[PDB]
Structure 1
Amino acid sequence: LHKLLFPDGYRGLNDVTYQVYYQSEQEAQRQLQTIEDGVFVEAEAPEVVKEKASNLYPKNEENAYDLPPLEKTVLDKQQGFNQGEHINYQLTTQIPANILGYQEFRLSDKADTTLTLLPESIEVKVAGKTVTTGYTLTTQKHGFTLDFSIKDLQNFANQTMTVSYQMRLEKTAEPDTAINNEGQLVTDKHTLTKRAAVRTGGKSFVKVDSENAKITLPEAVFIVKNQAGEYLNETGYRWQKEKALAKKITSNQAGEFSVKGLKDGQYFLEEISAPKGYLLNQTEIPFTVEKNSYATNGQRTAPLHVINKKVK
């Protein structure tokens, strides 16, 4: 018996149980494992079998099954991300009950060049359980491919597979721009692409005299704080306790300066060095990073004036 399964309307079929069971009264006939796979009454059959073969190369009809889906998801993405932050990504799919009928099943991701893949971060889970076998992993700088062994995928039949991985936003990440990746799923039966997007923020500033803003002031030096009273250090970025290790931003010849690569939030400048002839205010000077606080489609948002009082 060469058990054979055909999609509703071929391949071998294991896990089928076959049982084998003159009256003078064709019209009597009709009145009466891998060794490779699927080698007379069909008594029990895999869930995939809609219609069993008629009692007698037996011929089995498969249930209808939808193609497996693809979701691509970024965690905690509402406020954007700092340059250097480890952004958490998920590819989710459903290993179909008839996965043995597929020839290929490949998960892959491809990000803009300002998202750097962390290759050690990639972890396949099925039903919450880590899986480290039945795939070959190939990583590039901005992407990876997991090609799955069809045979091994059967133990995850009709269960959810998620691929967690991290990408880091590079310092080349421009604020106020769609920063994309395309997840993909490629089988012999179909292709699914799913895009996701992330963003970082920024704020431009100009240092000016407090009476006349047409007077721009070079050589003013600031550091940045969050609402916790932590200071920004370059390491991309990191918030930490030590003021001494704070990144220092300086007003250029036009008085202009900026912070690029922060998530949405409320921050503060703290002046640590006043332009010559001006007072050092140490009061925290508030500013907000939000969507379009830096630019809109490459058009730079006007700078926030930071005022300096001229000395008596």
Structure 2
Amino acid sequence: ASVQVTLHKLLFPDGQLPEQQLQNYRGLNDVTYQVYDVTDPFYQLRSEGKTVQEAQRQLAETGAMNRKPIAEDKTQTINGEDGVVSFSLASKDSQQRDKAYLFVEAEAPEVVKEKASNLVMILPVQDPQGQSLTHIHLYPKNEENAYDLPPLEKTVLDKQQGFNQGEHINYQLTTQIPANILGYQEFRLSDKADTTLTLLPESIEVKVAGKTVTTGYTLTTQKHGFTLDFSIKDLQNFANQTMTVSYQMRLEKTAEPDTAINNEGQLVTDKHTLTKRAAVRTGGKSFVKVDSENAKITLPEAVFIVKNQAGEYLNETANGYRWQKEKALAKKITSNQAGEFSVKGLKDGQYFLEEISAPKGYLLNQTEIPFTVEKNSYATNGQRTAPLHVINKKVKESGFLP
């Protein structure tokens, strides 16, 4: 003749166990309980004059010492209830005496700060009306460690020189999967960027500890951002580990130099929304074509191409700029009616103008003209930075000889 004893292990947040004083607990798996038969010491104490309660409290303290447990099992999910473990136990002994059992929480997950007290059960267990129960339900209560809300970092890789229009910019969102992640009901990472950044959808990789995360999320992408929705149950595998989301965005040709181009990362849980900003920039340089004798004389129709230190030529593609070796594919910049022209959408560096076509009445000089792109070489908060003078030498004493 047996009793079934079911333990429903509960976990409460730090400082929130009911003794410490709604819907703020969860079942906890992987808690090992041992059961000890304490029938003998129970009846000894009773014969010695101790009350039932007195003996039970003593047994709770000393009953496991020098006694091998008669059963051992772990809590697990049973019928969609987490933290369950059940034991089938004899009601009576050889002498026909109602038995007594001690339940000890032997080992428990890292999240537990304080284990449940030992439970001593003296059979028969009765309802308030004195009817013996065959199925007995206990609710041992664990206290959880204090844990922070998960952090967020948005990071742009190698961003100190800015970026060329067209360049594939590498980003990372980093967070820490908390130890108490099973306590959460929602975990979402998202990126949203200015319209001057276009997301490369196939670039999105989720890694934990350097290994790719295969499943456990949904992904939704737009032109300028995305959303990762994570299964809470599947995050448990990554508890206490760093998760890194890698992706790329292309900087578009609409990207103005010396403007903050913004993105915003977001971590959304049921508890809080955390937001992190990052920014990238591109660079430019303004020029004015002038006469070598009178700088107030500005010259239209001067035509230039742009070279880098390797001698490669700036080419314009559909989606940005590229450094290539064919001079025929070089983008052509032409001085306008006020002699003005600019180069926009370059990362910091040393570049050169090469004149390919001179204004009417001026000498062609093909000598490379050095210029520097750096923060604020184009503008400062909307205000344009003064143009570099490019001097042209007039055809010398023209109209004197045929």
Normalised to the residue count of structure 1, the TM-score between the two structures is 0.97
Give distance in 1, aligned partners of 2:162 and 2:364.
Answer: 33
User: Residue 289 of structure 2 corresponds to which residue in structure 1?
Assistant: 207
User: Residue 57 of structure 2 corresponds to which residue in structure 1?
Assistant: 30
Helix, strand or coil for the counterpart of 2:172?
Answer: strand
User: Residue 31 of structure 2 corresponds to which residue in structure 1?
Assistant: 16
Q: Which string of whole-angstrom CA distances, capped at 9 and with x for unpartnered residues, describes residues 117-156 of structure 1?
A: 1111111111111113111111111111111100000111
Q: Which string of whole-angstrom CA distances, capped at 9 and with x for unpartnered residues, describes residues 194-253 of structure 1?
A: 111111110011111111122211111111011111110112011111111111111111
Among 309, 313, 337, the alignment partner of 1:231 is 313
Give distance in 2, aligned partners of 1:143 and 1:229.
Answer: 37
Give distance in 2, aligned partners of 1:135 and 1:220.
Answer: 56
Q: Which string of whole-angstrom CA distances, capped at 9 and with x for unpartnered residues, describes residues 261-280 of structure 1?
A: 01111100001111121111
- How many residue pairs get aligned? The number is 310
Give distance in 1, aligned partners of 2:308 and 2:386.
Answer: 22
Helix, strand or coil for the counterpart of 2:57?
Answer: coil
Q: Which string of whole-angstrom CA distances, capped at 9 and with x for unpartnered residues, describes residues 262-299 of structure 1?
A: 11111000011111211111110011111111111111
Question: Over aligned residues, Cα RMSD in angstroms?
Answer: 1.3
Distance 1:283 1:14, change over 3 A: same
Normalised to the residue count of structure 2, the TM-score between the two structures is 0.75
Q: Which string of whole-angstrom CA distances, capped at 9 and with x for unpartnered residues, describes residues 7-32 of structure 1?
A: 111011110111111x8892122222
Helix, strand or coil for the counterpart of 1:244?
Answer: helix
Helix, strand or coil for the counterpart of 1:31?
Answer: helix
Structure number with higher relative contact order (C-alpha < 8 Å, ≥ 6 residues apart): 1
Give distance in 1, aligned partners of 2:54 and 2:200.
Answer: 69
CA deviation after TM superposition for structure 1 residue 71, in Å: 0.9
Give distance in 2, aligned partners of 1:133 and 1:214.
Answer: 66
Give distance in 2, aligned partners of 1:298 and 1:281.
Answer: 33
Give distance in 2, aligned partners of 1:99 and 1:229.
Answer: 55
Give distance in 1, aligned partners of 2:391 and 2:104.
Answer: 90
Aligned-residue sequence identity (percent) comes to: 99
Distance 1:303 1:24, change over 3 A: closer
Mapping 1:234-249, distance limit 5 Å: 234-235=316-317, 236-249=320-333
User: Residue 6 of structure 1 corresponds to which residue in structure 2?
Assistant: 12
Q: Does residue 257 of structure 1 match 2:341?
A: yes
Q: Which string of whole-angstrom CA distances, capped at 9 and with x for unpartnered residues, describes residues 157-180 of structure 1?
A: 000001111111111111111111
CA deviation after TM superposition for structure 1 residue 46, in Å: 0.6
Distance 1:54 1:76, change over 3 A: same
Helix, strand or coil for the counterpart of 1:229?
Answer: coil
- Structure 1: state its 5+ residue gaps: none
Q: Which string of whole-angstrom CA distances, capped at 9 and with x for unpartnered residues, describes residues 72-97 of structure 1?
A: 11111111111111111111110011
Distance 1:288 1:3, change over 3 A: same
Give distance in 2, aligned partners of 1:85 and 1:239.
Answer: 11
Distance 1:275 1:24, change over 3 A: closer
Q: Does residue 177 of structure 1 match 2:220?
A: no
Give distance in 2, aligned partners of 1:48 and 1:253.
Answer: 72
Q: Does residue 89 of structure 1 match 2:171?
A: yes
Kindly name which structure, 1 or 2, has the bigger radius of gyration based on alpha carbons.
2
Q: Which runs of 4+ in 1 moved over 3 A?
A: none
Structure 1 residues 210-219 or 292-301, which shifts more? 210-219
Helix, strand or coil for the counterpart of 1:272?
Answer: strand
Structure 1 residues 212-221 or 149-158, which shifts more? 212-221
Give distance in 1, aligned partners of 2:185 and 2:255.
Answer: 39
Give distance in 2, aligned partners of 1:11 and 1:145.
Answer: 28
Greater share of residues in helix: 2
Structure 1 residues 72-81 or 207-216, which shifts more? 207-216
CA deviation after TM superposition for structure 1 residue 302, in Å: 1.1
